[PDB]
Design a protein around this ligand. Structure first.
Ligand SMILES: *Cc1cc2c(nc3c(=O)[nH]c(=O)nc-3n2C[C@H](O)[C@H](O)[C@H](O)COP(=O)(O)OP(=O)(O)OC[C@H]2O[C@@H](n3cnc4c(N)ncnc43)[C@H](O)[C@@H]2O)c(*)c1C
Ligand SMILES: *[C@@H]1O[C@H](CO)[C@@H](O)[C@H](O)[C@H]1NC(C)=O
Length: 463
């Protein structure tokens, strides 16, 4: 019996190659690897997820879940041709528990709509990232850094419980009590490798007080060293109420952007040392806002935008290779900063973003060894993106950003951030001391390797 016949038993919506539904379902954030699946199935019930998992095993196809489809390597199209893509768009269950300070979120949510629901429900939030069309699922299962993460932790740090459909078909629950091993794995390594998460339960945080958004911007190739060095010096001492990111690109633009959980009249003592050592005359934007306005501004909407825009943020696409790396305190040496900028200036149509972690952050304050997310001792991460619009430049752009990664590598660590997924990183760079444990759990929960992609947790232990 065929896959059409098998999935038809479950009754979920499907799309199969050659139809227009299948064509539009192929949309992904990165258009570089246009993998062609066997089929798309759109579950709205746990039963139907169980059907897809059963049918893929019977027909002998691969199977990956897809949330918001932002995977930098197109792994939610399978990372290879011929997979069954289980698009979880139909799982939008929401509920807020004010007394418990928790919320239930279905694995189909995007960050934009999720922020709106949590704001309307109780002026709360989770510390998610700032791209509104990103799915909560991949985001949360790989970490998740946003502009309140230095106060409230990573998204993954706020997973209190998940429910997933495992490889043998059973609905499972994982939290600090039930199935602690699976619960460890999904907080940092949950993408695909252990089954299809159907819902999350998050710890939520009060954001009803005013907050303050700041951004200091320059357009001058000559002040890049000075601005980045000042960012590093300042970043070592930033209190947890601030989450900031630095930006830089080969056209000469650079900026510091951040969110302060506090009143604007308190902000300037906290950014004084950065501005004092950066170059003179930054473009200066400092703005007191409420939380749902902050979400809008962090995605370039005017703060007077209707909050309901967060339900209809247009999905945009790009074609790119991305890499990442972690840098430890006190940061790059001065020689490293010049090597980085010189390497950046050998090319174009790229950008570079530095998310601040640091010893004051809730991220670095987790006890190590309790989550699959290991990067608990860095000053900042580097996101390295090189784009193209014509495949002629694919090889030169891919070589450019890989040269850049190797230059920075001399002055930094070998660890990378798994939500900036990179097929050329060894898994030890993402999972390190916890990878043995991850493989043990993979053996236990999917011995047949039903759920795999080019960088799924393997079944063989390193010797
Ligand atoms: C496109 C995009 C990505 C961003 C952006 N900004 C970020 C930010 O501000 N902070 C961050 O920490 N990261 C940012 N990123 C990267 C994203 O965090 C990652 O790209 C996330 O992994 C995206 O998640 P999602 O949209 O759900 O992408 P998918 O491609 O669908 O999934 C990725 C990965 O996870 C597996 N998976 C999805 N769904 C499930 C379920 N339900 N159960 C198990 N596993 C699941 C997929 O199979 C795949 O392997 C800004 C922008 C614009
Ligand atoms: C699937 O495996 C888990 C743990 O191995 C077990 O608890 C569950 O009952 C299994 N379901 C089956 C065999 O249908």
């Amino acid at each position: 019996t065929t896959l059409k016949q098998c999935l038809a038993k479950g009754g979920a919506r499907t799309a199969f190659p050659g139809t227009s539904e299948y064509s539009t379902a192929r949309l992904a954030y990165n258009l570089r690897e246009r993998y062609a699946p066997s089929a798309f199935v759109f579950p709205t019930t746990v039963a139907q997820v169980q059907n897809a998992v059963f049918c893929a095993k019977q027909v002998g196809v691969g199977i990956v879940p897809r949330g918001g489809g932002h995977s930098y390597e197109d792994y939610s199209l399978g990372g290879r041709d011929g997979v069954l893509v289980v698009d979880m768009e139909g799982f939008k269950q929401f509920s807020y528990n004010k007394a418990a300070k928790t919320a239930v979120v279905g694995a189909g949510f995007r960050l934009g709509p999720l922020y709106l629901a949590l704001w309307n429900a109780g002026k709360v939030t989770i510390p998610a990232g700032n791209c509104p069309t990103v799915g909560i699922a991949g985001h949360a299962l790989g970490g998740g850094w946003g502009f309140s993460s230095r106060k409230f932790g990573l998204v993954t740090d706020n997973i209190l419980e998940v429910q997933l459909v495992a490889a043998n078909g059973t609905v499972v629950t994982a939290n600090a009590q039930k199935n602690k091993d699976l619960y460890f794995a999904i907080r940092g390594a949950g993408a695909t490798s252990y089954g299809i998460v159907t819902q999350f339960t998050f710890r939520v945080h009060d954001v009803s007080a005013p907050v303050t958004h700041f951004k200091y911007r320059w357009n001058d190739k000559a002040v890049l060293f000075k601005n980045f060095k000042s960012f590093q010096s300042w970043g070592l001492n930033v209190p947890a109420e601030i989450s900031a990111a630095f930006y830089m690109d080969p056209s000469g633009v650079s900026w510091l952007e951040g969110t302060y959980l506090g009143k604007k009249t308190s902000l300037l003592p906290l950014v004084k040392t950065f501005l004092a050592s950066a170059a003179p005359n930054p473009t200066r934007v400092e703005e007191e806002l409420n939380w749902i306005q902050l979400i809008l501004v962090n995605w370039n909407y005017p703060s007077n935008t209707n909050p309901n825009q967060l339900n209809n943020v247009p999905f945009t696409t790009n074609t790119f290779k991305a890499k990442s790396i972690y840098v430890n305190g006190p940061g790059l040496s001065d020689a490293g900063i010049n090597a980085m900028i010189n390497a950046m200036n050998t090319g174009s149509n790229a950008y570079f973003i530095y998310n601040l972690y640091g010893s004051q952050s809730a991220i670095n304050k987790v006890v190590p060894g309790e989550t699959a997310f290991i990067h608990r001792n860095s000053l900042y991460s580097i996101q390295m993106v090189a784009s193209w619009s014509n495949d002629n430049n694919a090889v030169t752009q891919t070589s450019y950003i890989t040269r850049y990664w190797k230059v920075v590598r001399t002055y930094a660590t070998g660890q990378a951030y798994q939500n900036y997924i990179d097929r050329d990183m060894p898994l030890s760079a993402y999972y390190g001391s916890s990878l043995s444990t991850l493989i043990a759990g993979k053996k236990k929960w999917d011995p047949q390797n039903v759920f795999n992609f080019p960088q799924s947790i393997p079944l063989k232990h390193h010797h």
